[PDB]
Amino acid sequence: SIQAEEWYFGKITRRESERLLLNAENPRGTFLVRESETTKGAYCLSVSDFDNAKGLNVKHYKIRKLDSGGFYITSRTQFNSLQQLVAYYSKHADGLCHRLTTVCPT
Numbered sequence: 001s002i003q004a005e006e007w008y009f010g011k012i013t014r015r016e017s018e019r020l021l022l023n024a025e026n027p028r029g030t031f032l033v034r035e036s037e038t039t040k041g042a043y044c045l046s047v048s049d050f051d052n053a054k055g056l057n058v059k060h061y062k063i064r065k066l067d068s069g070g071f072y073i074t075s076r077t078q079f080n081s082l083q084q085l086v087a088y089y090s091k092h093a094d095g096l097c098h099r100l101t102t103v104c105p106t
């Protein structure tokens with residue numbers, strides 16, 4: 001039950017998730033999952049990043065969910081649940097700006 005996972009912020013906006021992520025105390029990979037503002041049934045993985053080029057910044061990755069059942073960022077790499085997706089991405093950067101590290105403070 002996703003509503004329960006501590007990294008699931010549910011119904012919060014894009015701007016708010018960015019206000020939470022852009023804290024100077026956040027190390028690369030700080031993250032939360034929320035509802036997509038415009039695609040029903042889609043979610044967004046908001047992730048903090050940091051480089052000398054841009055400094056502290058946020059990326060937003062859409063997570064699709066099929067009725068066949070899979071959750072994914074790229075259809076090539078799918079998961080049976082949001083949790084497993086999160087777990088995978090905490091060990092693999094792959095196409096993400098950085099691997100999932102720590103849950104975003106509130």
Ligand SMILES: COC(=O)c1cc(C[C@H](NC(C)=O)C(=O)N[C@H]2CCCCN(Cc3ccc(-c4ccccc4)cc3)C2=O)ccc1C(F)(C(=O)O)C(=O)O
Nearest residue numbers: 014035036037038039044059060061062073074094095096
């Ligand atoms: C303007 O925005 C939107 O409409 C909107 C848009 C996005 C996508 C996001 N758009 C914005 C304006 O935030 C974006 O472009 N992120 C990039 C982030 C950087 C990577 C590049 N890329 C393409 C891509 C390439 C590779 C991979 C990848 C990842 C892991 C492994 C393999 C490949 C993922 C994506 C993305 O999707 C997500 C949520 C909402 C949205 F629903 C909304 O309603 O705004 C929201 O904020 O809620």
